[PDB]
Protein backbone atom coordinates (compact mmCIF):
# COMPACT_ATOMS: atom_id res chain seq x y z
CA UNK A 1 0.00 0.00 0.00
CA UNK A 2 1.48 3.30 -1.15
CA UNK A 3 1.78 6.36 1.06
CA UNK A 4 -0.46 9.16 -0.20
CA UNK A 5 -0.24 12.91 0.45
CA UNK A 6 -2.82 12.52 3.21
CA UNK A 7 -4.11 9.61 5.25
CA UNK A 8 -6.89 7.66 3.51
CA UNK A 9 -10.44 8.34 4.70
CA UNK A 10 -13.93 7.76 3.38
CA UNK A 11 -13.70 11.40 2.24
CA UNK A 12 -10.74 10.85 -0.10
CA UNK A 13 -10.61 7.13 -0.90
CA UNK A 14 -12.57 5.06 -3.40
CA UNK A 15 -12.37 1.52 -2.01
CA UNK A 16 -14.88 1.98 0.80
CA UNK A 17 -17.92 0.51 -0.92
CA UNK A 18 -19.81 -2.37 0.66
CA UNK A 19 -20.59 -5.41 -1.47
CA UNK A 20 -24.24 -5.15 -2.53
CA UNK A 21 -25.02 -8.67 -1.31
CA UNK A 22 -23.76 -8.06 2.22
CA UNK A 23 -23.73 -10.82 4.84
CA UNK A 24 -23.48 -8.32 7.69
CA UNK A 25 -26.18 -7.57 10.25
CA UNK A 26 -26.18 -3.83 10.88
CA UNK A 27 -27.52 -2.36 14.10
CA UNK A 28 -26.75 0.84 15.97
CA UNK A 29 -23.13 1.96 15.87
CA UNK A 30 -22.78 0.84 19.48
CA UNK A 31 -24.02 -2.63 18.52
CA UNK A 32 -21.74 -2.64 15.47
CA UNK A 33 -18.71 -1.73 17.56
CA UNK A 34 -19.46 -4.69 19.83
CA UNK A 35 -20.02 -6.95 16.82
CA UNK A 36 -16.68 -5.88 15.37
CA UNK A 37 -14.94 -6.57 18.67
CA UNK A 38 -16.55 -10.01 18.75
CA UNK A 39 -15.42 -10.70 15.20
CA UNK A 40 -11.89 -9.47 15.83
CA UNK A 41 -11.67 -11.52 19.00
CA UNK A 42 -12.45 -14.54 16.85
CA UNK A 43 -9.93 -13.43 14.22
CA UNK A 44 -7.24 -13.06 16.86
CA UNK A 45 -7.90 -16.56 18.15
CA UNK A 46 -7.87 -17.92 14.61
CA UNK A 47 -4.61 -16.25 13.60
CA UNK A 48 -2.99 -17.28 16.86
CA UNK A 49 -3.94 -20.90 16.16
CA UNK A 50 -2.80 -20.53 12.54
CA UNK A 51 0.57 -19.18 13.72
CA UNK A 52 1.15 -22.09 16.08
CA UNK A 53 0.27 -24.54 13.31
CA UNK A 54 2.51 -22.75 10.80
CA UNK A 55 5.50 -23.09 13.12
CA UNK A 56 4.82 -26.80 13.63
CA UNK A 57 4.53 -27.19 9.86
CA UNK A 58 7.90 -25.55 9.27
CA UNK A 59 6.66 -22.19 7.98
CA UNK A 60 8.36 -19.81 10.40
CA UNK A 61 7.94 -16.66 8.31
CA UNK A 62 4.25 -17.36 7.73
CA UNK A 63 3.87 -18.01 11.46
CA UNK A 64 5.33 -14.56 12.07
CA UNK A 65 2.84 -13.06 9.61
CA UNK A 66 -0.07 -14.70 11.46
CA UNK A 67 1.34 -13.44 14.76
CA UNK A 68 1.74 -9.91 13.40
CA UNK A 69 -1.80 -9.98 12.01
CA UNK A 70 -3.23 -11.32 15.26
CA UNK A 71 -1.51 -8.40 16.98
CA UNK A 72 -3.09 -6.08 14.41
CA UNK A 73 -6.54 -7.39 15.26
CA UNK A 74 -5.81 -6.75 18.94
CA UNK A 75 -5.08 -3.12 18.02
CA UNK A 76 -8.46 -2.99 16.26
CA UNK A 77 -10.16 -4.39 19.36
CA UNK A 78 -8.44 -1.74 21.47
CA UNK A 79 -9.65 1.07 19.22
CA UNK A 80 -13.21 -0.26 19.15
CA UNK A 81 -13.29 -1.10 22.86
CA UNK A 82 -12.21 2.43 23.79
CA UNK A 83 -15.30 3.78 22.04
CA UNK A 84 -17.66 1.23 23.57
CA UNK A 85 -16.20 1.86 27.04
CA UNK A 86 -17.01 5.57 26.90
CA UNK A 87 -20.62 4.82 25.99
CA UNK A 88 -21.08 1.72 28.15
CA UNK A 89 -18.55 1.51 31.05
CA UNK A 90 -19.92 -1.84 32.18
CA UNK A 91 -19.00 -3.44 28.86
CA UNK A 92 -16.45 -6.24 29.09
CA UNK A 93 -14.50 -7.53 26.09
CA UNK A 94 -15.53 -11.09 25.20
CA UNK A 95 -13.28 -14.13 25.11
CA UNK A 96 -13.57 -17.01 22.65
CA UNK A 97 -12.27 -20.53 22.23
CA UNK A 98 -9.52 -21.35 19.76
CA UNK A 99 -10.59 -22.83 16.39
CA UNK A 100 -8.81 -25.62 14.51
CA UNK A 101 -5.85 -24.83 12.29
CA UNK A 102 -5.44 -26.88 9.13
CA UNK A 103 -2.75 -26.97 6.44
CA UNK A 104 -0.86 -23.69 6.23
CA UNK A 105 -1.93 -22.88 2.68
CA UNK A 106 -5.61 -23.35 3.54
CA UNK A 107 -5.17 -21.25 6.68
CA UNK A 108 -3.74 -18.44 4.56
CA UNK A 109 -6.78 -18.73 2.27
CA UNK A 110 -9.14 -18.75 5.27
CA UNK A 111 -7.35 -15.66 6.53
CA UNK A 112 -7.53 -13.92 3.16
CA UNK A 113 -11.24 -14.65 2.83
CA UNK A 114 -11.94 -13.33 6.30
CA UNK A 115 -9.90 -10.19 5.64
CA UNK A 116 -11.72 -9.61 2.36
CA UNK A 117 -15.07 -10.00 4.11
CA UNK A 118 -14.03 -7.47 6.73
CA UNK A 119 -12.61 -4.91 4.31
CA UNK A 120 -15.33 -5.10 1.65
CA UNK A 121 -18.42 -6.08 3.61
CA UNK A 122 -18.40 -5.74 7.39
CA UNK A 123 -16.38 -2.60 8.00
CA UNK A 124 -17.81 -0.74 5.00
CA UNK A 125 -21.30 -1.57 6.32
CA UNK A 126 -20.42 -0.34 9.81
CA UNK A 127 -18.68 2.76 8.44
CA UNK A 128 -21.76 3.67 6.42
CA UNK A 129 -24.03 3.26 9.45
CA UNK A 130 -21.68 5.37 11.58
CA UNK A 131 -21.75 8.05 8.87
CA UNK A 132 -25.53 8.00 8.69
CA UNK A 133 -25.69 8.33 12.50
CA UNK A 134 -23.08 11.08 12.65
CA UNK A 135 -20.68 9.06 14.79
CA UNK A 136 -17.38 10.46 13.48
CA UNK A 137 -15.33 8.67 16.14
CA UNK A 138 -16.71 5.32 15.00
CA UNK A 139 -16.19 6.24 11.35
CA UNK A 140 -12.53 6.89 12.19
CA UNK A 141 -12.02 3.64 14.07
CA UNK A 142 -13.88 1.48 11.54
CA UNK A 143 -11.99 3.19 8.71
CA UNK A 144 -8.59 2.46 10.24
CA UNK A 145 -9.49 -1.19 10.78
CA UNK A 146 -11.00 -1.50 7.28
CA UNK A 147 -7.84 -0.18 5.62
CA UNK A 148 -5.59 -2.60 7.48
CA UNK A 149 -7.77 -5.59 6.58
CA UNK A 150 -7.23 -5.25 2.85
CA UNK A 151 -3.49 -5.01 3.51
CA UNK A 152 -3.75 -8.20 5.58
CA UNK A 153 -5.57 -9.87 2.69
CA UNK A 154 -2.77 -8.96 0.29
CA UNK A 155 -0.09 -10.12 2.73
CA UNK A 156 -1.82 -13.49 3.10
CA UNK A 157 -2.14 -13.95 -0.66
CA UNK A 158 1.51 -12.97 -1.17
CA UNK A 159 2.54 -15.50 1.48
CA UNK A 160 0.35 -18.13 -0.18
CA UNK A 161 1.93 -17.51 -3.58
CA UNK A 162 5.41 -17.75 -2.07
CA UNK A 163 4.58 -20.49 0.43
CA UNK A 164 7.62 -22.48 -0.72
CA UNK A 165 9.88 -19.45 -1.16
CA UNK A 166 10.11 -17.77 2.25
CA UNK A 167 12.83 -15.27 3.12
CA UNK A 168 14.29 -13.56 6.19
CA UNK A 169 12.12 -10.44 5.95
CA UNK A 170 10.55 -9.30 9.21
CA UNK A 171 6.93 -8.14 9.26
CA UNK A 172 6.61 -4.68 10.75
CA UNK A 173 3.38 -3.80 12.50
CA UNK A 174 2.29 -0.22 13.05
CA UNK A 175 1.94 0.82 16.73
CA UNK A 176 -1.56 2.28 16.38
CA UNK A 177 -3.19 0.63 13.37
CA UNK A 178 -3.13 -2.77 11.73
CA UNK A 179 -0.78 -1.93 8.88
CA UNK A 180 1.86 -4.58 8.27
CA UNK A 181 4.85 -4.16 5.99
CA UNK A 182 7.06 -6.99 4.78
CA UNK A 183 10.69 -5.95 4.81
CA UNK A 184 12.50 -2.68 5.52
CA UNK A 185 11.59 -0.72 2.38
CA UNK A 186 9.21 1.88 3.84
CA UNK A 187 9.35 5.21 5.68
CA UNK A 188 6.00 5.53 7.42
CA UNK A 189 2.59 3.93 7.78
CA UNK A 190 0.36 4.61 4.74
CA UNK A 191 -2.72 4.39 6.95
CA UNK A 192 -1.79 6.68 9.87
CA UNK A 193 1.67 8.05 8.99
CA UNK A 194 3.47 6.70 12.08
CA UNK A 195 7.23 6.57 11.34
CA UNK A 196 8.86 3.22 10.61
CA UNK A 197 11.02 3.42 13.73
CA UNK A 198 7.85 3.14 15.84
CA UNK A 199 6.81 -0.19 14.31
CA UNK A 200 7.19 -3.55 16.04
CA UNK A 201 9.07 -6.26 14.17
CA UNK A 202 7.75 -9.80 13.86
CA UNK B 1 5.40 -14.64 -6.81
CA UNK B 2 9.10 -15.40 -6.45
CA UNK B 3 11.00 -17.48 -8.99
CA UNK B 4 12.03 -20.78 -7.41
CA UNK B 5 14.98 -22.91 -8.51
CA UNK B 6 12.42 -25.39 -9.82
CA UNK B 7 9.19 -25.01 -11.78
CA UNK B 8 6.29 -25.24 -9.29
CA UNK B 9 4.19 -28.39 -9.54
CA UNK B 10 1.68 -30.30 -7.45
CA UNK B 11 4.63 -32.54 -6.58
CA UNK B 12 7.02 -29.91 -5.20
CA UNK B 13 4.61 -27.24 -3.92
CA UNK B 14 2.62 -27.00 -0.70
CA UNK B 15 -0.29 -24.76 -1.68
CA UNK B 16 -2.26 -27.35 -3.64
CA UNK B 17 -4.60 -28.48 -0.87
CA UNK B 18 -8.28 -28.04 -1.64
CA UNK B 19 -10.80 -26.48 0.73
CA UNK B 20 -12.82 -28.95 2.81
CA UNK B 21 -16.16 -27.29 2.09
CA UNK B 22 -15.86 -27.36 -1.69
CA UNK B 23 -18.34 -25.53 -3.91
CA UNK B 24 -17.06 -27.42 -6.94
CA UNK B 25 -18.99 -30.18 -8.70
CA UNK B 26 -16.39 -32.81 -9.57
CA UNK B 27 -16.96 -35.25 -12.41
CA UNK B 28 -14.70 -36.95 -14.93
CA UNK B 29 -11.61 -35.03 -16.03
CA UNK B 30 -13.34 -34.44 -19.37
CA UNK B 31 -16.31 -32.89 -17.60
CA UNK B 32 -13.99 -30.93 -15.30
CA UNK B 33 -12.03 -29.50 -18.23
CA UNK B 34 -15.34 -28.37 -19.72
CA UNK B 35 -16.44 -26.95 -16.37
CA UNK B 36 -13.14 -25.07 -16.09
CA UNK B 37 -13.61 -23.68 -19.60
CA UNK B 38 -17.14 -22.57 -18.76
CA UNK B 39 -15.85 -20.89 -15.61
CA UNK B 40 -12.98 -19.19 -17.41
CA UNK B 41 -15.34 -18.06 -20.16
CA UNK B 42 -17.40 -16.45 -17.42
CA UNK B 43 -14.28 -14.96 -15.84
CA UNK B 44 -13.14 -13.55 -19.18
CA UNK B 45 -16.53 -11.92 -19.75
CA UNK B 46 -16.48 -10.65 -16.18
CA UNK B 47 -13.01 -9.09 -16.41
CA UNK B 48 -13.75 -7.64 -19.83
CA UNK B 49 -16.85 -6.00 -18.33
CA UNK B 50 -14.84 -4.84 -15.32
CA UNK B 51 -12.20 -3.32 -17.60
CA UNK B 52 -14.86 -1.42 -19.53
CA UNK B 53 -16.34 -0.14 -16.28
CA UNK B 54 -12.91 0.76 -14.90
CA UNK B 55 -12.15 2.95 -17.90
CA UNK B 56 -15.51 4.71 -17.55
CA UNK B 57 -14.80 5.08 -13.83
CA UNK B 58 -11.42 6.71 -14.49
CA UNK B 59 -9.08 3.90 -13.44
CA UNK B 60 -7.01 3.30 -16.57
CA UNK B 61 -4.31 1.21 -14.91
CA UNK B 62 -6.84 -1.03 -13.18
CA UNK B 63 -8.66 -1.36 -16.50
CA UNK B 64 -5.40 -2.61 -18.00
CA UNK B 65 -5.03 -5.11 -15.15
CA UNK B 66 -8.54 -6.43 -15.84
CA UNK B 67 -7.68 -6.63 -19.54
CA UNK B 68 -4.44 -8.49 -18.83
CA UNK B 69 -6.21 -10.90 -16.51
CA UNK B 70 -8.99 -11.44 -19.05
CA UNK B 71 -6.23 -12.32 -21.53
CA UNK B 72 -4.78 -14.70 -18.94
CA UNK B 73 -8.10 -16.52 -18.60
CA UNK B 74 -8.22 -16.79 -22.39
CA UNK B 75 -4.82 -18.48 -22.27
CA UNK B 76 -6.25 -20.92 -19.71
CA UNK B 77 -9.22 -21.58 -21.99
CA UNK B 78 -6.81 -22.26 -24.84
CA UNK B 79 -4.84 -24.81 -22.83
CA UNK B 80 -7.98 -26.52 -21.55
CA UNK B 81 -9.75 -26.44 -24.91
CA UNK B 82 -6.75 -28.02 -26.63
CA UNK B 83 -7.05 -30.96 -24.25
CA UNK B 84 -10.84 -31.25 -24.46
CA UNK B 85 -10.66 -31.16 -28.26
CA UNK B 86 -8.26 -34.09 -28.16
CA UNK B 87 -10.65 -36.00 -25.88
CA UNK B 88 -13.65 -34.87 -27.96
CA UNK B 89 -12.68 -33.18 -31.30
CA UNK B 90 -16.07 -31.66 -32.07
CA UNK B 91 -16.43 -29.96 -28.69
CA UNK B 92 -17.70 -26.39 -28.88
CA UNK B 93 -16.74 -23.80 -26.27
CA UNK B 94 -19.68 -22.25 -24.37
CA UNK B 95 -20.76 -18.61 -24.45
CA UNK B 96 -21.83 -16.43 -21.52
CA UNK B 97 -22.13 -10.03 -16.47
CA UNK B 98 -23.06 -7.23 -14.06
CA UNK B 99 -20.35 -4.71 -13.22
CA UNK B 100 -20.24 -2.53 -10.11
CA UNK B 101 -17.83 0.06 -8.73
CA UNK B 102 -14.16 -0.53 -9.48
CA UNK B 103 -13.19 -1.45 -5.93
CA UNK B 104 -16.02 -3.98 -5.68
CA UNK B 105 -15.08 -5.46 -9.05
CA UNK B 106 -11.51 -5.97 -7.82
CA UNK B 107 -12.90 -7.77 -4.77
CA UNK B 108 -15.26 -9.88 -6.89
CA UNK B 109 -12.26 -10.73 -9.04
CA UNK B 110 -10.14 -11.62 -6.03
CA UNK B 111 -12.88 -13.85 -4.62
CA UNK B 112 -13.27 -15.69 -7.91
CA UNK B 113 -9.51 -16.17 -8.22
CA UNK B 114 -9.33 -17.49 -4.68
CA UNK B 115 -12.12 -19.95 -5.41
CA UNK B 116 -10.31 -21.19 -8.52
CA UNK B 117 -6.88 -21.49 -6.90
CA UNK B 118 -7.99 -23.10 -3.63
CA UNK B 119 -11.15 -24.99 -4.55
CA UNK B 120 -11.86 -25.63 -8.23
CA UNK B 121 -8.44 -26.25 -9.73
CA UNK B 122 -7.09 -28.25 -6.78
CA UNK B 123 -10.20 -30.46 -6.96
CA UNK B 124 -9.75 -30.93 -10.71
CA UNK B 125 -6.02 -31.58 -10.34
CA UNK B 126 -6.63 -34.38 -7.83
CA UNK B 127 -9.34 -35.97 -9.95
CA UNK B 128 -7.01 -35.84 -12.96
CA UNK B 129 -4.29 -37.53 -10.90
CA UNK B 130 -6.78 -40.20 -9.82
CA UNK B 131 -7.67 -40.85 -13.46
CA UNK B 132 -4.04 -40.73 -14.57
CA UNK B 133 -4.54 -37.80 -16.95
CA UNK B 134 -1.09 -36.21 -16.75
CA UNK B 135 -1.87 -33.60 -19.40
CA UNK B 136 -4.87 -32.39 -17.42
CA UNK B 137 -2.86 -32.33 -14.20
CA UNK B 138 -0.34 -30.11 -15.98
CA UNK B 139 -2.90 -27.75 -17.50
CA UNK B 140 -4.90 -27.45 -14.28
CA UNK B 141 -1.70 -26.87 -12.28
CA UNK B 142 -0.52 -24.09 -14.57
CA UNK B 143 -3.93 -22.41 -14.35
CA UNK B 144 -4.18 -22.88 -10.58
CA UNK B 145 -0.83 -21.15 -10.03
CA UNK B 146 -1.78 -18.13 -12.10
CA UNK B 147 -5.08 -17.66 -10.27
CA UNK B 148 -3.48 -17.00 -6.90
CA UNK B 149 -1.15 -14.50 -8.60
CA UNK B 150 -4.26 -12.82 -10.07
CA UNK B 151 -5.83 -12.69 -6.61
CA UNK B 152 -2.78 -10.93 -5.20
CA UNK B 153 -2.68 -8.50 -8.13
CA UNK B 154 -6.33 -7.61 -7.57
CA UNK B 155 -5.82 -7.01 -3.84
CA UNK B 156 -2.71 -4.93 -4.52
CA UNK B 157 -4.70 -2.82 -6.99
CA UNK B 158 -7.51 -2.50 -4.45
CA UNK B 159 -5.13 -1.29 -1.74
CA UNK B 160 -3.64 1.30 -4.10
CA UNK B 161 -6.85 2.15 -5.94
CA UNK B 162 -6.20 5.86 -5.41
CA UNK B 163 -2.45 5.59 -5.95
CA UNK B 164 -1.96 4.32 -9.53
CA UNK B 165 1.36 4.48 -11.35
CA UNK B 166 2.72 4.00 -14.87
CA UNK B 167 3.68 0.34 -14.49
CA UNK B 168 2.67 -1.96 -17.32
CA UNK B 169 1.24 -5.40 -16.61
CA UNK B 170 3.25 -8.08 -18.37
CA UNK B 171 1.41 -11.26 -19.32
CA UNK B 172 3.24 -14.51 -19.99
CA UNK B 173 2.83 -15.94 -23.51
CA UNK B 174 1.87 -19.46 -22.40
CA UNK B 175 0.47 -19.18 -18.88
CA UNK B 176 -1.60 -16.72 -16.88
CA UNK B 177 1.26 -15.16 -14.95
CA UNK B 178 1.06 -11.36 -14.73
CA UNK B 179 3.84 -9.14 -13.46
CA UNK B 180 3.40 -5.49 -12.54
CA UNK B 181 6.42 -3.46 -13.55
CA UNK B 182 9.65 -4.31 -15.34
CA UNK B 183 11.57 -5.77 -12.38
CA UNK B 184 11.59 -9.44 -13.40
CA UNK B 185 13.59 -11.76 -15.65
CA UNK B 186 11.25 -14.68 -16.27
CA UNK B 187 7.91 -16.27 -15.44
CA UNK B 188 7.93 -18.00 -12.03
CA UNK B 189 5.31 -20.47 -13.25
CA UNK B 190 6.72 -21.65 -16.59
CA UNK B 191 10.10 -19.88 -16.76
CA UNK B 192 9.38 -18.06 -20.04
CA UNK B 193 11.77 -15.08 -20.40
CA UNK B 194 10.47 -11.53 -19.95
CA UNK B 195 11.16 -10.82 -23.63
CA UNK B 196 8.28 -13.13 -24.61
CA UNK B 197 5.68 -11.36 -22.46
CA UNK B 198 3.01 -8.98 -23.75
CA UNK B 199 2.57 -5.63 -22.01
CA UNK B 200 -0.83 -4.30 -20.96
FE1 LIG C 1 -7.18 -8.26 9.59
FE1 LIG D 1 -7.51 -15.80 -12.95
FE1 LIG E 1 -10.04 -7.91 11.51
FE1 LIG F 1 -0.51 2.94 11.12
FE1 LIG G 1 -9.50 -18.39 -14.05
FE1 LIG H 1 4.40 -18.43 -17.72
Swiss-Prot record, chain B:
GO function terms (MF aspect): iron ion binding; oxidoreductase activity
* GO annotations of cellular component type: cytoplasm
Query: Where in the numbering of this chain does the Rubredoxin-like domain appear?
Result: 167-200
Q: Where does Fe cation 2 bind?
A: 73, 113, 147, 150
Q: Which residues form a coiled coil?
A: none
List the keywords (alphabetical).
Cytoplasm, Electron transport, Iron, Metal-binding, Transport
Q: What functional role does this protein have?
A: Exhibits NADH peroxidase activity (in vitro).
By its UniProt entry, which PANTHER family does this protein fall under? RUBRERYTHRIN
Record protein name field: Nigerythrin
Please give the organism. Nitratidesulfovibrio vulgaris (strain ATCC 29579 / DSM 644 / CCUG 34227 / NCIMB 8303 / VKM B-1760 / Hildenborough) (Desulfovibrio vulgaris)
What's the encoding gene here?
A: ngr
